[PDB]
Write a protein that binds this ligand. Structure first.
Ligand code: CLA
Ligand code: CLA
Ligand code: CLA
Ligand code: CLA
Ligand code: CLA
Ligand code: CLA
Ligand code: CLA
Ligand SMILES: CCCCCCCC(=O)OCC(=C\C=C\C(C)=C\C=C\C=C(C)\C=C\C=C(/C)C=C=C1C(C)(C)C[C@H](OC(C)=O)C[C@@]1(C)O)/C=C/[C@@]12O[C@]1(C)C[C@@H](O)CC2(C)C
Ligand SMILES: CC(/C=C/C=C(C)/C=C/[C@@]12O[C@]1(C)C[C@@H](O)CC2(C)C)=C\C=C\C=C(C)\C=C\C=C(C)\C=C\[C@@]12O[C@]1(C)C[C@@H](O)CC2(C)C
Ligand SMILES: CC(/C=C/C=C(C)/C=C/[C@@]12O[C@]1(C)C[C@@H](O)CC2(C)C)=C\C=C\C=C(C)\C=C\C=C(C)\C=C\[C@@]12O[C@]1(C)C[C@@H](O)CC2(C)C
Ligand SMILES: CC1=C(C/C=C(\C)CCC[C@H](C)CCC[C@H](C)CCCC(C)C)C(=O)c2ccccc2C1=O
Lengths: 171, 73, 34, 30, 162, 80, 223, 153, 147, 130, 72
């Protein structure tokens, strides 16, 4: 037996079907992640990603910041929370500008078919081309993704701060 | 020697060939141009000279430093 | 507001906010199309 | 020691010099 | 008790009680899943039993080297995290189970690459199954001996309580 | 894309054409040399600027000259 | 052991010779790949399969090198800037945020306990560096337990990072000695050539020799 | 669009100034200065002779409240698809038409009413700053004078 | 990937990051810009000269203002051989208490002035922190004139 | 095993084409071989030819031409290289007129030919602001 | 930037490009400008700029600090 084969029977792609790229564990694990989980609107994907990211982002800032405390301090928690929230704001700014400069679409998975059927004799790159058919690959989709990331980041950072305070106080 | 290496590491062959051109002009003016035409070191040889001088200079500096320090004390 | 509060008002303002907005504007400008 | 009024009006005049700078910057074109 | 992998020399197609002679393919897939999960968990349990007995670096020593005693000494908030991790792993395994072409114990998705299996692949799967069975018997014996005697594996062996 | 020019000092020795890695140069009929052929550059959009063409030129100061210009994904040799 | 100049000179000389010889081994591996490698005779063997996924190897080695360099050296720079800012409790020091090399200390403990427990026929540890008594000859220390603290953690990770970068340069030279996305026929240019030209944005030092040149520099740094 | 947003903020800030005056008058607005040992040397304002004058704790609290409101604003800015009124104009959208010297006299919760009140509030802030600069008293002192004394009482 | 090197269409068509790098490094080479004439060249150079002189005057005004505001010019007048001139105050959040104490000069951490502006301004007849402020005001006015 | 029967017996390499040769352009080289010779890919390692029609896809024209130059060592000459745009827009590239560029063919006009040597080039100062 | 030239940095950048293109959770983000190594002239300029800035900074620090710490 051989556990490495050309990806999708194409020996010319710059890719391989290894026990890591195309394993059933990899398939299921990546399909349960918010970025690829089926049945999620882009706002929901952004909200979940932001929640998880703020939740694990408050950690390093609170623990190793400039205002640490070997005991529990409200000032240390507030400093870590503010740093995490501002980092989420910076990431949201990056997401917003990236989406602004990347896509020009409001409804995908159709425009591609329209220009593959009804011809696309225009300036292209909006009618024709169009990389990716996901709802995240639109101006509207990425805007809602960034909004969800930002709101979920705030909520997750607050939740993680509350959990840290409870763990440090009642344990 | 380590600083000398940086002449070969930072520069390029064309400048040295064009300088050798004027030096050869002077030699021809004085009828002393060699029959074996002088050419600047090839690019690969320039890199080899640079790395050899760099290694020699650095290793010799550390050699002298270590030996003097550990023999004195 | 005393004059000695001006450093604490301005240094964060300039040295953090101005980079952010300048980066936003420059990235948007250099990533434009025609 | 200079007063708050002295620093404030210098800041205001500096703002005016800034608006004159962008006008020159925009006039030198994109 | 089929052309399934796991039939070794000492007892080929070992179904003395005929559990598989009447079961359909789905029940047999369930049986293979249970056997493989038990075998893997038992291999981990046996290795942990021994290593814990002669090495427990974590928790700043303490956590008495006898198993079934350190079971009641872990902070009980580390128990929760292990439980949640096992739960997430088995949720992922459940998600794997609905992938097309799924095989009972195959969570790596080897069916994607292994069409027309060889004798080496079958032999390695049988090796895993047999090691799992031996580890199941071994961990059952470990737990029973520690319950009845009170000493751990290398402690009971060292004293000579055999 | 880079610019490639051919000069009438061409002797039609074909060494430039058989050294081009991207099929930019070709040999075309001519009446200015013994070989009756001169190099041409009809596919400069594929020119990468490696200058292998003028490394194989035997004429005194070259008959094929490559002038580097605007860059393109083809001229930059980008497989991505 | 009490002739400190001899010990220092022997160690430094042998480490230098080792680094040079390792760079030479990488160079001659690249030379073999350029010259003596036959694609037909190596169909689907280990050498072929390594070349077939050279990208993955080099990209992950690049990531590891960046991770190790960022961490080791930036911890050094963080210590430097915390000390320069008068914040002595924010350093990566023993009296501060401490990075104890626990794995190496465990090994040191295992060796000093080996005589009588795992090496029952030994009377003393193999080396007093792992632990034990101070051995002095004529009031001069011959050997003594070498304590490992946060300072040794940082320098050991610096060693790992430098070694990884040298391996990156040399392995990139060996694997990309025959072809690449830039020059699909790099093997036809030989092992030793300066470039392919100013095109493709510039194709300096694409050889495999120019990788043994950069690797020589990085070996000098590491040693 | 910018005029409408700035008018809304000016009205809300007239409310905030009234609240700040009330808090200062009524024993709220914590006393003292920030702890340099707790919040680093960036809160230190000056060292006259062996004592470190720090940022007042009242200023820090007011800055935190303003941070709350500004954060709400930033969220609404990066929430364009879920807010009733966006901060910026969409490509294509055209700016509402200027109201003119006098906006239409339409009482109630109308665009003209909010427009007029925002202009009035912004002019009031301009006049307040001008009076404070010309005469030389504190902003809250000017508001207290302009309310007869019913604020800082 | 377009419109940044407005002065060069050849760079604006570059699909790589080289366009951004070369856009910076060719911005002031006006003679190489697209659709270029000599009259536009001299006029743009003239305007750039004006902006440059404005920048110089603003820099001098800033030095004057910061000496007047955070310096010790007046104290240095009475004892020029013992008092060390102060360039400007320091506000850096990364300072520890030790750094604040070491850089502390009079009322706030500050940098000693190594530009010799104290001696130059004292020689030309400046004795007050209000004389420096007048100079800063006048220089900002001159910068506005040049812009 | 493979998508098409005419593909060379290659096991796939992480050096093939990328997202660029799905939205900008891809290059295909076709050739017929008498023997299933073992050859080295321009991207990765060793592949096996088909005793008949062979078709390979690459991300660059240079890769296809390097493969073709390698094919000449196998006495293979009929190799032809095409450019494919994002849709099936096939354009024959290398044997443009059916004759290799090194051999003179009638019907070719000189492109980029100057009727003077290098020394006849105009002075750059006379080429200012055009 | 002066000793190591291009060509060695283009292939490494190509490997990084492949790594980014072939990894999940990061395929969602793609560059607009193709990342390439700095040009030969640009690399020379950048190395010269680093050399000069480091030269000036280290000598300014040395001269100022030495004068201050030696002459009171
Ligand atoms: C070019 C001259 C120059 C330079 C290099 C500096 C440098 C500095 N000033 Mg400053 N300043 C200047 C002129 C200058 N000043 C002038 C003319 C004024 C009067 C309005 C001030 C008023 C001022 C205050 C009130 C404060 C500073 C502060 C500071 C420090 C922190 C930066 C900051 O907050 O800036 C803020 C600067 C301003 C608000 C004024 C604008 C500065 C000038 C007018 C603009 C010059 C632009 C320049 C020519 C090119 C711009 C490049 C740009 C396009 C990227 C820093 C040492 C802070 C400080 O001391 O912290 C310890 C502080 O609180 N400055
Ligand atoms: C002029 C430039 C400048 C300035 C003013 C600062 C300022 C600061 N830096 Mg910083 N930094 C800079 C450049 C700068 N940096 C650069 C260039 C680097 C890279 C070399 C760094 C690397 C760096 C590190 C590695 C760290 C800092 C930290 C800090 C903070 C000092 C520690 C402290 O006591 O605060 C304590 C901080 C808090 C109590 C919370 C502050 C959180 C942000 C800054 C508040 C911003 C509020 C903002 C308006 C919110 C917007 C609304 C939002 C809610 C939606 C301070 C905010 C430290 C820090 O605090 O980390 C976060 C720290 O660990 N900096
Ligand atoms: C069924 C498996 C199992 C269980 C329930 C336990 C339970 C326990 N072990 Mg343990 N252990 C195991 C296997 C197991 N061990 C194995 C196989 C080893 C050999 C590496 C060890 C080595 C070990 C040491 C050295 C120590 C413990 C200790 C402990 C106790 C504290 C928890 C802890 O720190 O774990 C620590 C566990 C590890 C360091 C290794 C766990 C590695 C896991 C089992 C493999 C990967 C699991 C993965 C997440 C799921 C599989 C993926 C896929 C197959 C689906 C606790 C009673 C500590 C104690 O107090 O001793 C008395 C202690 O110091 N264990
Ligand atoms: C995702 C990262 C992550 C993080 C931040 C933590 C964080 C923590 N774990 Mg933990 N853990 C994780 C993943 C993680 N876990 C995983 C994947 C496993 C495997 C199941 C465990 C298994 C585990 C055990 C078994 C124990 C911890 C414990 C702890 C706590 C003490 C750690 C410490 O050094 O004190 C700061 C701390 C709250 C210990 C604890 O809570 O005891 C007090 C403990 O006994 N963890
Ligand atoms: C002091 C000079 C110096 C430095 C810093 C480096 C740094 C590096 N070289 Mg090296 N190199 C040097 C001299 C140096 N080199 C010389 C003289 C030569 C000539 C032979 C080479 C030849 C060479 C080759 C041939 C290769 C390298 C590689 C590398 C990288 C290894 C990965 C790594 O650690 O990245 C991490 C980066 C650092 C450790 C630098 C410091 C970063 C700080 C500590 C942390 C981050 C700071 C933060 C982002 C600042 C933000 C604030 C700012 C925006 C204001 C790294 C960037 C390899 C490579 O490409 O990378 C894999 C490689 O193949 N180098
Ligand atoms: C790599 C080198 C390095 C490292 C590790 C640190 C570390 C630190 N610095 Mg620091 N620093 C460095 C270089 C470095 N520095 C350099 C070069 C400079 C000079 C420019 C400084 C200047 C500096 C200042 C001025 C300050 C610090 C401070 C700090 C501390 C807090 C930083 C913080 O907020 O974390 C933020 C951390 C994160 C947001 C998370 C990043 C790391 C995460 C955990 C990676 C996770 C990877 C994960 C495992 C991947 C697998 C995921 C899995 C699910 C698959 C921390 C101890 C501050 C302090 O006082 O602390 C004592 C401070 O004020 N630094
Ligand atoms: C830093 C100072 C500051 C302050 C005090 C405020 C205050 C306010 N903003 Mg705001 N804002 C600011 C800066 C600020 N903004 C900036 C810089 C921006 C641009 C990003 C915005 C963008 C903005 C929007 C888009 C919105 C607000 C809104 C609001 C109001 C929310 C309060 C509330 O829920 O009342 C109870 C309040 C008037 C919201 C509003 O109109 O009131 C609900 C609203 O929708 N702001
Ligand atoms: C500045 C105040 C001065 C007072 C002086 C002392 C007080 C002080 O110091 O304050 C600071 C302070 C607390 C301040 C708290 C504040 C401001 C909270 C504000 C929260 C705002 C919220 C939720 C806005 C929500 C808006 C929304 C949803 C807006 C919206 C909409 C709607 C509504 C139109 C709906 C639309 O619907 C659609 C279509 O989307 C969407 C959108 C966006 O348009 C505490 C201070 C101190 O605790 C500290 C720090 C230290 C202590 O030791 C001492 C004290 C107690 C003093
Ligand atoms: C925006 C504004 C006020 C904004 C106030 C806001 C947001 C409120 C903020 C606060 O709530 C917070 C945030 C927090 C609170 O704790 C504090 C306050 C402060 C209360 C005033 C503008 C005030 C703006 C004014 C007065 C503009 C005057 C413009 C004139 C006269 C222009 C004239 C010309 O245009 C013509 C006519 C013809 C042209 O050709 C020539 C010229 C000459 C340029
Ligand atoms: C509108 C305004 C405030 C509006 C506040 C609003 C809407 C608040 C709404 C709320 O929802 C919030 C936000 C938060 C809730 O919790 C509270 C409520 C209440 C529910 C202030 C205006 C305040 C307006 C002021 C102060 C105006 C001052 C004007 C002056 C001094 C005029 C002087 C002149 O007229 C003369 C004298 C002579 C002329 O010739 C020349 C000039 C100069 C024009
Ligand atoms: C100076 C220089 C030259 C010119 C160098 C030449 C022509 C070498 C001349 C060597 C002389 C002629 C012989 C050596 C004379 C020494 C005194 C002998 C060595 C000393 C002994 C002790 C070993 C290059 O050709 C060159 C090429 C590429 C990059 C950089 C450079 C470069 O820097």
């Amino acid at each position: 037996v051989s556990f490495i084969k050309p990806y999708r029977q194409d020996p010319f792609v710059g890719h391989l079907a290894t026990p890591i790229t195309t394993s059933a564990f990899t398939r299921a694990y990546l399909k349960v992640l918010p970025a690829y989980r089926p049945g999620l609107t882009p706002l929901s994907r952004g909200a979940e990603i932001g929640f998880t990211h703020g939740y694990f982002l408050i950690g390093p800032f609170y623990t190793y910041g400039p205002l640490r405390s070997v005991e529990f301090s409200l000032t240390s928690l507030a400093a870590g929370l503010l740093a995490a929230i501002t980092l989420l704001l910076i990431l949201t700014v990056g997401l917003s500008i990236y989406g602004q400069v990347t896509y020009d679409v409001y409804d995908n998975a159709l425009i591609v078919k329209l220009v593959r059927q009804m011809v696309g004799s225009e300036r292209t790159q909006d009618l024709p081309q169009i990389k990716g058919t996901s709802e995240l690959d639109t101006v509207l989709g990425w805007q809602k993704f960034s909004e969800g990331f930002f709101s979920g980041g705030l909520i997750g950072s607050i939740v993680a701060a509350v959990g840290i305070a409870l763990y440090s106080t009642y344990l | 020697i380590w600083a000398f290496s940086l002449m070969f590491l930072f520069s390029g062959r064309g400048y040295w060939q064009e300088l050798i051109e004027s030096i050869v002009w002077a030699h021809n003016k004085l009828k002393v141009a060699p029959s074996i035409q002088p050419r600047a070191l090839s690019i690969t040889q320039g890199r080899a000279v640079g790395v050899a001088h760099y290694l020699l200079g650095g290793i010799g500096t550390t050699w002298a430093f270590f030996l003097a320090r550990i023999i004195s004390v | 507001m005393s004059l000695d509060l001006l450093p604490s008002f301005f240094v964060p303002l300039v040295g953090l906010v101005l980079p952010l907005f300048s980066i936003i504007g420059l990235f948007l400008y250099i990533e434009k199309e025609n | 020691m200079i007063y708050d009024s002295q620093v404030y009006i210098a800041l205001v005049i500096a703002v005016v010099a800034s608006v004159l700078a962008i006008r020159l910057g925009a006039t030198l074109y994109n | 008790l089929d052309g399934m992998i796991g039939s070794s020399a000492p007892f080929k197609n070992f179904d003395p009680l005929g559990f598989a002679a009447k079961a359909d393919q789905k029940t047999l897939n369930k049986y293979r899943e249970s056997e493989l999960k038990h075998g893997r968990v038992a291999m981990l349990a046996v290795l942990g039993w021994i290593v814990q007995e002669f090495w427990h670096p974590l928790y700043d020593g303490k956590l008495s080297s006898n198993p079934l005693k350190a079971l009641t000494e872990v902070p009980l908030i580390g128990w929760a995290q292990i439980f949640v991790a096992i739960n997430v792993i088995e949720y992922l395994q459940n998600k794997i189970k609905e992938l097309p072409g799924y095989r009972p114990g195959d969570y790596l998705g080897t069916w994607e690459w292994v069409e027309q299996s060889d004798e080496g692949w079958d032999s390695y799967q049988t090796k895993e199954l047999n090691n799992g069975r031996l580890a199941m018997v071994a961990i059952a014996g470990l737990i029973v001996q520690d319950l009845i005697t009170g000493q751990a594996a290398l402690e009971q062996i060292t004293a000579g309580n055999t | 894309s880079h610019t490639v020019k051919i000069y009438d000092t061409c002797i039609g020795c074909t060494q430039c054409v058989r050294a081009c890695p991207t099929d930019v140069l070709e040999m075309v009929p001519w009446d200015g040399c013994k070989a009756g052929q001169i190099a041409s550059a009809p596919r400069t959009e594929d020119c990468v600027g490696c200058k292998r063409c003028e490394t194989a030129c035997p004429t005194d100061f070259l008959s094929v000259r490559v002038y580097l210009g605007g860059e393109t994904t083809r001229s930059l040799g980008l497989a991505y | 052991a009490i002739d400190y100049p001899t010990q220092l000179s022997l160690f430094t000389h042998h480490v230098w010779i080792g680094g040079f010889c390792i760079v030479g081994g990488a160079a001659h591996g690249a030379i073999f790949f350029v010259r003596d490698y036959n694609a037909a005779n190596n169909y689907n063997n280990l050498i072929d399969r390594v070349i077939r996924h050279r990208d993955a190897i080099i990209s992950h080695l690049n990531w590891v090198c960046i991770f190790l360099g960022c961490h080791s050296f930036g911890l050094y720079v963080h210590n430097d800037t915390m000390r320069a800012l008068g914040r002595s409790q924010d350093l990566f020091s023993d009296n501060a945020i401490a990075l104890k090399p626990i794995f190496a200390q465990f090994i040191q403990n295992l060796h000093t306990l080996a005589p009588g427990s795992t090496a029952p026929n030994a009377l003393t540890t193999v080396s007093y560096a792992f632990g034990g008594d101070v051995i002095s000859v004529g009031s001069k220390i011959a050997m003594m337990p070498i304590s490992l603290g946060t300072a040794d953690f940082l320098v050991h990770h610096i060693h790992a990072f430098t070694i990884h970068v040298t391996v990156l340069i040399l392995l990139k030279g060996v694997l990309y000695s025959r072809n690449s996305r830039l020059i699909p026929d790099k093997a036809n240019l030989g092992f030793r050539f300066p470039c392919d030209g100013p095109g493709r944005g510039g194709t300096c030092q694409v050889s495999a020799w120019d990788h043994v040149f950069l690797g020589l520099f990085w070996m000098y740094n590491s040693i | 669009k910018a005029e409408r947003w700035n008018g809304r903020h000016a009205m809300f800030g007239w409310i905030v100034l009234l609240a700040t005056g009330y808090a200062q008058a009524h024993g709220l607005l914590p006393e003292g200065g920030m702890d340099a040992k707790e919040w680093g040397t960036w809160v230190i304002v000056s060292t006259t002779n062996g004592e470190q004058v720090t940022i007042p704790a009242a200023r820090a609290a007011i800055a935190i409240g303003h941070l709350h409101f500004g954060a709400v604003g930033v969220f609404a800015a990066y929430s364009k698809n879920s807010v009733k009124d966006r901060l910026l104009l969409e490509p294509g959208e055209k700016d509402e038409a200027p109201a003119g010297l006098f906006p239409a006299l339409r009482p109630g919760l109308t665009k003209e009413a909010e427009m007029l009140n925002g202009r009035v509030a912004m002019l009031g802030l301009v006049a307040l700053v001008a009076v404070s600069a010309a005469t030389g008293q504190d902003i809250l002192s000017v508001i207290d004078q302009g309310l007869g004394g019913l604020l800082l009482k | 990937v377009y419109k940044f090197p407005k002065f060069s269409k050849a760079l604006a068509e570059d699909p790589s990051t080289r366009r951004i790098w070369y856009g910076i490094a060719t911005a002031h080479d006006f003679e190489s810009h697209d659709a270029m004439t000599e009259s536009k060249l001299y006029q743009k150079i003239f305007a750039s000269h004006f902006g440059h002189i404005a920048i110089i005057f603003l820099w001098t005004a800033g030095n004057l203002f910061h000496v007047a505001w955070q310096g010790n010019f007046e104290a240095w007048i009475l004892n020029p051989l013992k008092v060390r001139p102060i360039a400007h105050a320091i506000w850096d959040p990364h300072f520890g208490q030790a750094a604040y104490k070491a850089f502390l000069k009079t009322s706030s951490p500050a940098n000693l002035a190594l530009s010799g502006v104290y001696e130059w301004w004292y020689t030309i007849g400046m004795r007050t922190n209000n004389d420096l402020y007048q100079g800063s005001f006048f220089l900002i006015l001159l910068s506005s004139l040049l812009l | 095993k493979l998508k098409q029967s005419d593909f060379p017996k290659f096991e796939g390499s992480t050096g093939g084409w990328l997202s660029a040769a799905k939205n900008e352009e891809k290059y295909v080289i076709i050739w017929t071989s008498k023997d299933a010779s073992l050859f080295e890919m321009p991207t990765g390692g060793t592949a096996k030819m088909n005793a008949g029609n062979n078709v390979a896809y690459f991300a660059r024209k240079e890769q296809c031409l390097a493969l073709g130059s390698q094919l000449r060592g196998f006495k293979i000459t009929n190799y032809k290289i095409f450019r494919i745009y994002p849709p099936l827009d096939i354009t024959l590239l290398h044997p443009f007129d059916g004759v290799f560029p090194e051999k003179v063919n009638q019907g070719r006009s000189p492109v980029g030919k100057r009727d003077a040597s290098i020394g006849g080039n105009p002075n750059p100062a006379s080429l200012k602001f055009q | 930037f002066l000793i190591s030239w291009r060509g060695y940095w283009q292939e490494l950048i190509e490997t990084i490009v492949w790594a980014h293109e072939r990894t999940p959770l990061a395929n969602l983000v793609r560059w607009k400008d193709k990342p390439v190594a700095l040009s030969i002239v640009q690399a020379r300029l950048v190395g010269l700029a680093h050399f000069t800035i480091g030269y000036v900074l280290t000598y300014a620090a040395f001269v100022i600090a030495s004068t201050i710490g030696k002459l009171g």
